[PDB]
Write a protein that binds this ligand. Structure first.
Ligand code: HEM
Ligand code: HEM
Ligand SMILES: N=C(Nc1cccc(COC[C@@H](CN)OCc2cccc(/N=C(/N)c3cccs3)c2)c1)c1cccs1
Ligand SMILES: N=C(Nc1cccc(COC[C@@H](CN)OCc2cccc(/N=C(\N)c3cccs3)c2)c1)c1cccs1
Ligand SMILES: C[C@H](O)[C@H](O)[C@H]1CNc2nc(N)[nH]c(=O)c2N1
Ligand SMILES: C[C@H](O)[C@H](O)[C@H]1CNc2nc(N)[nH]c(=O)c2N1
Ligand SMILES: [Zn+2]
Lengths: 403, 404
């Protein structure tokens, strides 16, 4: 039985046959669905993942069964049999990184998947060198506000030694300073990394939007601290198109979302440090980062400024303030000429993506809870779209924190 | 760690383990290879085991497990099944089972109320005319002039050979949907099929946007019969907005009583094919889904234009702004009319309370995250941040094929 996938707004039906290509189990069983959980609840092994990936590559370039194909499978085989591991060619790495993005079920931005700048940093041997590559990535991806998706791939995990890691969860994160009275100044999501930085010798600030240094770690060495040059970190002050007091809130966000703690897996090889970046969808900032109760939690402040009745849920004060805050983000990014996409445009392009992928591959792995935006869910076409979630490789995965 | 699903709340940092899912006797649609959680619609000795399990649940709930009363009931059920192929529930077992089915429903955000359900036992009903009388009484009781009371009416169970009692309509109150010459719809497009069935069965159709449908009621082995709800039994709320004075001019309205009539209530393997139940609305059901879905009344653009918003560009957030005011209008109008309604913030807070209660009572709670999270303002509600485990327990409300 292959899944029947229905769109409830349009009445149309497709069948996902791509899910038969999945080789890794998810969290669900017949007895119970664990779909809403955030985190996951030998040589022959490597060799079959490696061959499968080599097959994916030669098929993508329309050279399946070529002499080039047969000989590359022999190289991979020879190298695994002798050494227990193998190495990718740059062109395979490029193909693999794009496929890992294509395959990411939680990503609404996958219409863009073919357009990814891949920096090969596999010749990196020190934390100092990782920093140089990271600075070049930021400069390239930022591009004065005309954002360009990029990934930098540092050296693969190797059976002997420690991993290359970027300890920070993103390349740009704001500090979170825990008070003696438990409360937090700045971003509560970043309390632990903030403390790690101070402990490794960073002189901390005391503002709401202090940009953290990077803790970069080469194998089996303590991490090293590197402050990002302020000119490399583009930020956008937040103002509202009609509410004058909104700028008085002193709010800002950074332009460049760059995730730096996920493991990249290609053909059985694992890249423990492979930071990737694109551009933001406005609800990430406007709704989650600014309005989550465990984040900057600004809903009440904005509601009061708007003079809303805060004493009762049924005035929909939270909803009204969230909308204005999202509007402010979109407005302020647009005024700063910094790439951003609203949740309506983003979900519409994802629907087009689902259709491209249906034709190209016979399905598309998608995690409904992550694709539907955190405000105005049913106002976007993705709410009414059934989705099938499953794990294809190449993949981005979670990995343990290195401390 | 415990060998049970670990469930995390990301707002609070707290962890529970669901041990109740161990009581699931019935598979869902997911496998290790793929998750199908977002899909909307994904006996002889078999009866006896379902029956025994249910009787065991009953005697547990009254604290007499392994008692002599418990063992005699088991024997009596097997005897009844032995000689008749079926069995029948005691009044108090029916009441316990109907509440349990509600308690068990993974898609219901209103379950904090599960213990407060008026169970009307209509297992003596023998005609479509009598079903109608029972339904009118249900509506009068549940509506209670706007102070809504949860209720279920239970018609006779499916019986070997004999045809089912069925209510053909999906709810007791539905507005007509009339297919137009140009291909668009007047009224509620959700109800085009039931509207045309009403016409095929002799109803004289109106032509407004909010025409209440007649009921199509079917007693065993008979053609359904058509019944018009007396207008004064169907409480409606005209919609106005607290500050936008033109909103009243739109002539929008919704009915007070949501009463689902096409689900099958399954208890101990017995099947109640006609068992309409009612509670009250969460405001987003009306203001977001019913009024704003593109395939429903689809009023977003009309409202946005009245608000003078920029409908030519997604990034004005015109849809979001209009939807908020429409939801506000629903809340304000039900409040002014003194008709029970619950907003999506208050409903989700109470559901978080429900989760805590069930963790202590039963060691978990089956919940369908996609359905529990409201359709506007998702992450503004505490349920967004709460992991949930979905599984099927019995007694259960289930979908059943349409009678036609
Ligand atoms: C080009 C613009 C892009 C947009 C607008 C975008 C949008 C998003 C959004 C909104 C999320 C959910 C994030 C959250 O809730 O915290 C996400 C998830 C993700 N996207 Fe993207 N995406 C983009 C490009 C990329 C790129 C370049 C990659 C990698 C090459 C990527 C890989 C991912 C992955 C792996 C996830 C899931 C992370 C997780 O499971 O925790 N996306 N995407
Ligand atoms: C007391 C007030 C109640 C509220 C506010 C409420 C709220 C809701 C809401 C919003 C839904 C989702 C409906 C949709 O999106 O179409 C739902 C689903 C459901 N509720 Fe309730 N509920 C209430 C009482 C009841 C009662 C009395 C029963 C039955 C005894 C019930 C059983 C159900 C079932 C079976 C579903 C799932 C329908 C399906 O799977 O298709 N609830 N509830
Ligand atoms: N507040 C309430 N809301 C509520 C509770 C439960 C159900 C409902 C409304 O029914 C939900 C229904 C309608 N969208 O969703 C499930 C469903 C069931 C059956 C058919 C559906 N759609 C179709 N048209 C089909 C496609 C293929 C076969 S049928 C969809 C509303 C209450 C009602 C009763 C007590 S509380
Ligand atoms: N627009 C973008 N946004 C984006 C894309 C992907 C990811 C992200 C941000 O990461 C999401 C993260 C952070 N909330 O959520 C999931 C997560 C991942 C890993 C660990 C998590 N939890 C923990 N670290 C734990 C704490 C205590 C025990 S475990 C939680 C943002 C882009 C980023 C890069 C290209 S596009
Ligand atoms: C419990 C729940 O799965 C969790 O809050 C998820 C829901 N959907 C999400 N969707 C996105 N895009 N990002 C998230 O962090 C989450 N969090
Ligand atoms: C495809 C998707 O499952 C579908 O649109 C669901 C999503 N969540 C829902 N949630 C509720 N409460 N009611 C619904 O009808 C739906 N529809
Ligand atoms: Zn699942």
């Amino acid at each position: 039985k292959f899944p029947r996938v229905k769109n409830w707004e349009l009445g149309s039906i497709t069948y996902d046959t791509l899910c038969a290509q999945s080789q890794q189990d998810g969290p669900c069983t017949p007895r119970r669905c664990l779909g809403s959980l955030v985190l996951p609840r030998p040589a022959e092994q490597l060799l079959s993942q490696a061959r499968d990936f080599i097959n994916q590559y030669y098929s993508s370039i329309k050279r399946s069964g070529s002499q080039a194909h047969e000989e590359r499978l022999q190289e991979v085989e020879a190298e695994v049999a002798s050494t227990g591991t193998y190495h990718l060619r740059e062109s395979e790495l490029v193909f693999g990184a794009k496929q890992a993005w294509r395959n990411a079920p939680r990503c609404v931005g996958r219409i863009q998947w073919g357009k990814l700048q891949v920096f090969d940093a596999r010749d990196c041997s020190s934390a100092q060198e990782m920093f140089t590559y990271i600075c070049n990535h930021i400069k390239y991806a930022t591009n004065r506000g005309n954002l360009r998706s990029a990934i930098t791939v540092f050296p693969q995990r190797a059976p002997g030694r420690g991993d290359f890691r970027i300890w920070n969860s993103q390349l740009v994160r704001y500090a979170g300073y825990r008070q003696q009275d438990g409360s937090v100044r700045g971003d509560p999501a970043n309390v632990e990394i903030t403390e790690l930085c101070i402990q490794h010798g960073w002189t901390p600030g005391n503002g709401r939007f202090d940009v953290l240094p990077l803790l970069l770690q080469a194998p089996d060495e303590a991490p090293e601290l590197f402050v990002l040059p302020p000119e490399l970190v583009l930020e956008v002050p937040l103002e509202h198109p009609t509410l004058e007091w909104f700028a008085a809130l002193g709010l800002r966000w950074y332009a460049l979302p760059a995730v730096s703690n996920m493991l990249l897996e290609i053909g059985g090889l694992e890249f423990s440090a492979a930071p990737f970046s694109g551009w933001y969808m406005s609800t990430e900032i406007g709704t989650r980062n600014l309005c989550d109760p465990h984040r900057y939690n600004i809903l009440e402040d904005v509601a009061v400024c708007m003079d809303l009745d805060t004493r009762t849920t049924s005035s929909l004060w939270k909803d009204k303030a969230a909308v204005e805050i999202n509007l402010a983000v979109l407005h302020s990014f647009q005024l700063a000429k910094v790439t951003i996409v609203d949740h309506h445009a983003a979900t519409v392009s994802f629907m087009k993506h689902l259709d491209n992928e249906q034709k190209a591959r016979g399905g598309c792995p998608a995690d409904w809870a992550w694709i539907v935006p955190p405000i105005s869910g049913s106002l976007t076409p993705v709410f009414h779209q059934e989705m099938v979630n499953y794990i294809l490789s190449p993949a981005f995965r979670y990995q343990p924190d290195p401390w």
